[PDB]
């Protein structure tokens, strides 16, 4: 039975393959070429804040653009304020391996992560005069690597034992749970519509998920090594992704294809975290080389780098005005670059 | 504006208290040192951890001549460990624990060793090997009927140390034998490494006490190598 | 996609000699470090033998010291094991390994329950 099941399992491979090539008409880099050219955009850097011991590994801006909030290895949650360089809230954390963190869309919650596969989630607006931790979830068997809000009462989570739920905080519950890659899951973006999303793993592709349904509508290949890092742009119908082997590539939804690859020569270390821009004209992407770069989405050039970084980079955050981008590495810094 | 003016003096009183909790905390999290203990089922990692403790994650912590320690186990997670495994480059040293008699299972063990000797986030760390269960070495290759050689062809030819530290109860073949696992696991140690980390191995039973001093030895003498190579002092 | 296919296998008579060949396509093939595994019946997965990136390091495990050679083949993109000399504790499944990162000098998770790297295999019969 299994034979039969390989065999049109192949046929389905083949079938894929052939609608897959009959939806190329031509490529990117020709009809993209008459544009103007962007320019240089060299960028420069702002205010730095300190106050941290060990390393980074997340960072969400806001919403009105200008608080934020980061996590640390010493159990560490500081949420800052930008305008002003100053710090409001330092709260601590019970397991001292945090992973991801995360800023409620709403600016009244933040969400945090890590290694004992738990989710606790922190209400910022208190009756009682500090920050206590209402509610944790749990149900997973293994670490968890993302946690990003659709409202008060939503949240989708994404755990390296293969599977993520969208729970319900009133009842702290599993509503649906998507499964179905055969690896582990790293990073997730939600869209603006606030419809359907996406999940990159280690499997070396990608796939689409919808929240209401709960069955996945479409998979992604094309990258070699595990997937770390995606976002969406802003219209909803692309999404850039950057794996291990130091490779950004960008899909389309509608045409279920890959359009650009964004590859070069000299580069060997892999990236970690991306992001995208206002006008859908600058995507950034944070490497390990302590080097950061600003690509540019129509073309296929290069023209902006970021330094200033001793460590390896691990979060990187585009603001909801543009008005400027943060970033954080492994040396317990976060610079603010307009 | 001078409702503002006192609500900015108040967020600056905010900024310095938040400020002195973090000194407070930073002054306690740079005293304390923290390890991993890596190691396999059919070896003894328990044993070990009360030894030291009658003195997804569990912890020991410990306390040895005014000195603290802790210690992380992991094994609420799955069989891959290549992502995790990242989150620990500001250890002190791994411990390494291996059973020195189960042959079978004997070169999975030396694998996983080289994993950790040659990475990116690994390579400043420094390494405590145990190979644990003697006397079931000595028992079961002085009763006979299983040969070295059938999983290591070369075993027959080795040459019994040119030093070493055998008890006055201790024959020819249980020396030979647990001298050539414990070269075994150093040749790895000494063909990669560019000075920068070593290998301590000791021998330990199920009956021990005395596996906190080594510890204290091995993080002393893996301080003061590290602190030397930074005054340019060789 | 990735995809990694085995070719060979069938019953061996005792003393005998065969050849293993796993050829991949997906990746390019002269970045990566690529071994053999094993699974005999009524056991778990093991370890055979491997090679480094250029065709340079090769090292074998002791119980098949001086009967296995394995080599790999850069230009045809394919991964070849030498069996000579067999014996009759040797009957088991085959499976060409991958490991995850290019351009490095180790890997963990060659032997898992599952690793999404790993091609089907073949079963050998002695």
């Known amino acids: 039975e299994l034979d039969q099941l390989r065999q049109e399992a192949e046929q389905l491979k083949n079938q894929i393959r052939d609608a897959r090539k009959a939806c190329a008409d031509a490529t990117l880099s020709q009809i993209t070429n008459n544009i103007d050219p962007v320019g240089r955009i060299q960028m420069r850097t702002r205010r730095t804040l300190r106050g941290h011991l060990a390393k980074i590994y997340a960072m969400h801006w806001g919403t009105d653009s200008r608080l934020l909030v980061s996590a640390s290895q010493d159990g560490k949650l500081i949420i800052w304020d930008s305008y002003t360089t100053n710090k409001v809230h330092a709260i601590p954390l019970r397991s001292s391996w945090v992973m991801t963190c995360a800023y409620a869309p709403s600016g009244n919650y933040v969400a945090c992560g890590g290694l004992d596969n738990i989710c606790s989630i922190y209400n910022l607006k208190t009756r009682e005069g500090n920050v206590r931790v209402s509610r944790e979830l749990a149900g997973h068997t293994g670490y968890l690597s993302c946690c990003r809000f659709l409202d008060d009462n939503q949240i989708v989570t994404s755990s390296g034992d293969t599977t993520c739920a969208l729970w319900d905080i009133e009842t702290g519950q599993q509503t649906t749970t998507f499964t179905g890659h055969t690896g582990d899951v790293m990073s997730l973006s939600l869209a603006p519509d606030t419809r359907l999303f996406v999940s990159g793993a280690c499997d070396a592709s990608a796939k689409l998920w919808d929240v209401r349904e709960g069955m996945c509508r479409q998979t992604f290949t094309g990258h070699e090594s595990d997937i770390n890092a995606i976002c969406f742009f802003p219209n909803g119908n692309a999404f850039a992704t950057g794996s291990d082997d130091a490779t950004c590539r960008l899909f389309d939804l509608r045409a279920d294809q890959e359009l650009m690859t964004y590859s070069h020569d000299n580069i060997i270390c892999g990236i970690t975290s991306v992001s995208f821009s206002k006008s859908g004209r600058l995507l950034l992407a944070g490497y390990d080389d302590f080097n950061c770069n600003v690509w540019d989405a129509l073309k296929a050039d290069r023209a902006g780098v970021l330094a200033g970084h001793d460590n390896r980079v691990s979060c990187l955050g585009v603001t909801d005005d543009g008005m400027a981008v943060a970033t954080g590495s492994w040396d317990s810094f976060l610079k603010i670059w307009n | 504006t001078e409702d503002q003016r006192n609500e900015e003096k108040a967020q600056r009183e905010a900024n310095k208290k938040i400020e002195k909790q973090l000194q407070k905390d930073k002054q306690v999290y740079r005293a304390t040192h923290r390890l991993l203990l890596l190691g396999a089922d059919n070896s003894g990692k328990s044993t070990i951890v009360k030894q030291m403790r009658i003195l997804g994650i569990f912890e020991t912590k410990f306390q040895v001549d005014k000195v603290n320690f802790h210690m992380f186990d992991v094994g609420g997670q799955r069989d891959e460990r290549r992502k995790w495994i990242q989150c620990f480059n500001d250890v002190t040293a791994i411990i390494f624990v291996v059973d020195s008699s189960d042959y079978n299972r004997l070169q999975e063990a030396l694998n996983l060793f080289k994993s950790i000797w040659n990475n990116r986030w690994l390579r400043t760390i420094s390494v405590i090997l145990f190979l644990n269960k003697q006397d079931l070495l000595a028992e079961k290759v002085l009763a006979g009927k299983s040969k070295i050689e059938d999983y290591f062809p070369e075993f027959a030819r080795y040459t019994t140390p040119e030093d070493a530290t055998p008890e006055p109860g201790e024959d020819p073949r249980v020396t030979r034998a647990k001298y050539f696992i414990r070269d075994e696991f150093l040749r790895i140690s000494t063909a990669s490494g560019d000075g920068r980390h070593y290998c301590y191995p000791h021998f330990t039973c199920a009956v021990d006490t005395e596996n906190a001093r080594r510890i204290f030895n091995d993080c002393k003498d893996i301080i003061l190598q590290m602190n030397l190579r930074e005054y340019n002092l060789v | 996609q990735v995809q990694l296919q085995e070719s060979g296998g069938g019953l061996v008579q005792p003393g005998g000699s065969l050849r293993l060949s796993c050829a991949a396509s997906g990746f390019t093939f002269s970045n990566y470090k690529m071994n053999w595994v094993r699974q005999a019946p009524g056991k778990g997965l093991e370890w055979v033998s491997d090679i480094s990136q250029s065709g340079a390091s090769i090292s074998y495990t002791g119980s098949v010291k001086g009967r296995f050679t394995i080599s790999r083949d850069n230009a045809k993109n394919t991964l070849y094991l030498q069996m000579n000399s067999l014996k009759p504790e040797d009957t088991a499944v085959y499976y060409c390994?991958?490991?995850?990162?290019?351009?490095?000098?180790?890997?963990?998770?060659?032997?898992?329950?599952?690793?999404?790297?790993r091609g089907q295999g073949t079963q050998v019969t002695v």
């Open positions: 390994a991958r490991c995850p990162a290019p351009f490095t000098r180790d890997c963990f998770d060659v032997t898992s329950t599952t690793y999404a790297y």
